[PDB]
Amino acid sequence: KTSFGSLKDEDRIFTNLYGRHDWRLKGAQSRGDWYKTKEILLKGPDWILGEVKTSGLRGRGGAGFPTGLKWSFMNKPSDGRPKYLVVNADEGEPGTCKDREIIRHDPHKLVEGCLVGGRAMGARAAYIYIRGEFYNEASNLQVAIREAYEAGLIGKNACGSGYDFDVFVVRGAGAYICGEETALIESIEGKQGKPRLKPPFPADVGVFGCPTTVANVETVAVSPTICRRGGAWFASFGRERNSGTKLFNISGHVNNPCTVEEEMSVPLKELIEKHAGGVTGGWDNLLAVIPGGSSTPLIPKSVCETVLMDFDALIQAQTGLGTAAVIVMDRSTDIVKAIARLIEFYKHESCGQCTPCREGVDWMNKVMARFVRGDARPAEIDSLWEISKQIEGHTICALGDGAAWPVQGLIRHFRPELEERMQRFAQQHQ
């Protein structure tokens, strides 16, 4: 196919996304959930991983790793230790609230995804790490898990298969760095949420020292629909190596911010003008677009017109898809203040274990505050770029890269505004 977008309503995986049906077991089973799951559990982990590999499903957390290879990293014999599948539901990334809607409205899809993923790698039990502030969503998930346990779907002889399974929920304590998989693994174990170094990878040494596979909410909940509908159906959408459907959160200076399921290769402008109502003041009132939240650099209107919102095309556009969160800023926005607020958010949310992030994020916060006040020199700006090059690639986890990227994008795409601001401050105050 050449023109993408405009996903059909019958091909949308996440039905009852807006909460227009019942979220309990009766509403879940009347929409197509928990159908022939016993055959899925009986056909074998190799068959399940083959169906995942045929679909071409990639990591929806924000890194875009192939889910088939990562899930096949556990296809090894047991060594006297159990195996665990952990579903990441921290949701600390600004601009992204799709997994909150998935948990609050369709929890049984997530539970069936946990069971299918646990059988797919021989996991003894599943843990779900939810945010501390998501008390009502955690309570809804607990109600759904209790109704699944009481109906014999999971527990002893789960879904009439002979392979037992347990699903747990562990509530967080309000930390963004706990969204990282190794910091999440450490936070489950009662330690502080500080990430580990890889190697050892979590597939070898994870939670409690046992083998552990950490996966996003939507890349887990899609898997029952992958195993039921088929590999070719899920691989038909989008370009090659970018297959599937994605939940896009459009927010910012838009008339109707929302969360919408769409095909992968939908253009940005078409998606905004169709599923969100367009930018206030017209499309020509657009100034900047953040494509996937705080972990990717912004792009201007000159490139946003003809860009494709998948991994490869946005990587070619010197940015990243990330969590697919379209933040929109129009021409009436002080984007220096927006990047300063983003860097201050990173300053307030940083685990501080490894020193380059721990010092350079506060350094960037001070430099951005001086830039907002305009008390800066032009020769400082390139130095700031060099500071980013001392953070990107020298950190334990990827929060340092996610801190260096928005400043690099802001400099690269809006240097004349920064020079104008500092020249204006120098002309006025001196």
Partner: protein, 213 residues
């Protein structure tokens, strides 16, 4: 905003504190939830339970959590200081947290803040004289498509106007609990100007399952 404890008369290790027996049963359920030999993994939830017994964490729940779980108290100190959910100071009965990250700052959360100062007469991090409300500024709470937004205790109030949050304050002053949902024309996350998708009925079970399942 301090990470060192000083021995105050209100907050001392000799302050009386204990779990209720129902809280002890919940603590034992949380302990049984985890594998044997790793009871320290129950440090994070059980201490949370202690907050739900008090609303704030003195330095007696830290030592108590260390006593039941047989962990050193300094690990409990590290856990309670690393995370921002634990109130290590006595907060009010209603804990207002306003989000001011970029997707919420773009949709004018500053008007909501200025309404809070102009209504209650306290600064950020300042308490009311009757210890009923405490206003703090927080990061993103995962309600970005419903910006602007605040949270109170465990409830979310999204798509707020200054008049709406003032009315929320007066309704809380009457003692009634508000409705934790978006206050605009939308319900949870749908577009306000009609539904873009999901208007067709769901297709039910058995829709296009692969052969040989």
């Amino acid at each position: 905003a301090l990470f060192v404890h000083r021995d105050t008369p209100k907050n001392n290790p000799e302050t009386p504190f204990d779990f209720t027996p129902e809280n002890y049963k919940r603590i034992e359920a949380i302990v049984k939830n985890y594998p044997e030999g790793h009871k320290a993994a129950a440090v994070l939830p059980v201490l949370d339970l202690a907050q739900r017994q008090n609303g704030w964490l003195p330095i007696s729940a830290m030592n108590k959590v260390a006593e039941i779980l047989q962990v050193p108290p300094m690990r409990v100190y590290e856990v309670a200081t690393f995370y921002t959910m634990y109130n290590r100071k006595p907060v009010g009965k209603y804990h207002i947290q306003v989000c001011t990250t970029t997707p919420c700052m773009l949709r004018n959360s500053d008007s909501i803040l200025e309404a809070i100062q102009k209504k209650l007469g306290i600064k950020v991090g300042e308490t009311t004289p009757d210890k009923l409300f405490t206003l703090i500024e927080v990061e993103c709470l995962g309600a970005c498509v419903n910006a602007p937004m605040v949270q109170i205790n465990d409830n979310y109030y999204e798509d707020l106007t200054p008049k709406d949050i003032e009315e929320i304050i007066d309704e809380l002053k009457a003692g009634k609990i508000p409705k934790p949902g978006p206050r605009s024309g939308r319900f949870s996350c749908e577009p306000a100007g009609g539904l873009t998708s999901l208007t067709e009925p769901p297709k039910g079970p058995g829709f296009g399952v692969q052969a040989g399942l």
